[PDB]
């Protein structure tokens, strides 16, 4: 295809960095998928098959955003869980 | 005679508050550390009723500092999740 | 004792209304305690034993605030739990 | 042939979004309802590839509306918990 999807690549890279920054690793299935698709997109970029490159980069961006909100949901439940245990200990002291 | 187990319970709550991220900058943790220092002053003086009550007050303020910091951390994580889902909707609504 | 703890009663009533407003009922142990101690505070008020009435009303206020944050913690965990199930269904659709 | 199971899955998603509090005022729910109406127009026309695709897009927008509303409801409850604990600390710090 054509032209080079350089702005899509930039968007995909941004989503990958956002997911890694919140704590997502290769152990998060969606981040492993995102990194694999982003690598395949670069392989299509070198081949100058830009329609294929754009479609793998779009898919990689989505999987990276799914990994990010997956990790943040677990992190939010864990903090709220620790707040709950804290508040049970406070009531036990005051009761 | 000495309220040794309460003193230990007060130390446990002080460590729990510091472990979730509370510092001397959290007003309730500074109060807890001051009331615990005063409890140790009373311990050395062998004024064990005064020591027990100050250790109890210090334990409460340490638990209040812990829940104060955990509420802010819970709001921040939920805030980051909200920004994340706004970016997801923007991507998926690119054609809308 | 003396004087009438009218401002304390007012703070106790305010805490009771705040706890009931977030969904706390007689089934939340701390709200049942708060309502019982408040009733006992009013019996002491009529008896003009204002030291006893203040101490009961203070205890009732605390238990009402503990019931309020107990219910709000459970409501916050339930909403975050529903958000988690929703995002699992979203990932299932997109995967 | 006819995407009958997809149409039911799209209806289920729309009912779930409305059940958590989303209305026509949720932009993603308004989109989902518009795309579902267009999917029914294609169903009656017996253009089942068009019907399936619009129904799948409507399902996605309904799931996006649902998690959008649940994020705001989670932030509001956590916000109410924060105000509640500020009042508790104020009461217990009356002597501080």
UniProtKB/TrEMBL annotation, chains B, D:
Which keywords does this Swiss-Prot/TrEMBL entry list? Coiled coil, Signal
Per the record's keyword annotation, is Coiled coil included, yes or no? yes
Please give the coiled-coil regions recorded for this protein. 48-91
Q: Where is the DUF4398 domain?
A: 5-80
Q: What is this protein called?
A: DUF4398 domain-containing protein
Report where the shown chain sits in the full-length sequence: first residue, last residue, total length.
Answer: 24 to 119 of 119
């Amino acid at each position: 295809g054509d032209p080079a999807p350089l702005e899509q690549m930039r968007l995909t890279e941004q989503a990958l960095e956002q997911a890694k920054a919140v704590g997502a690793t290769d152990d998060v299935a969606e981040l492993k998928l995102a990194q694999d698709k982003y690598a395949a997109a670069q392989i299509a970029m070198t081949a100058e098959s830009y329609k294929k490159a754009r479609l793998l980069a779009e898919q990689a961006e989505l999987d990276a955003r799914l990994a990010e909100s997956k990790v943040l949901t677990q992190k939010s439940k864990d903090q709220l869980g620790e707040l709950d245990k804290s508040l049970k200990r406070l009531r036990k002291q005051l009761g």
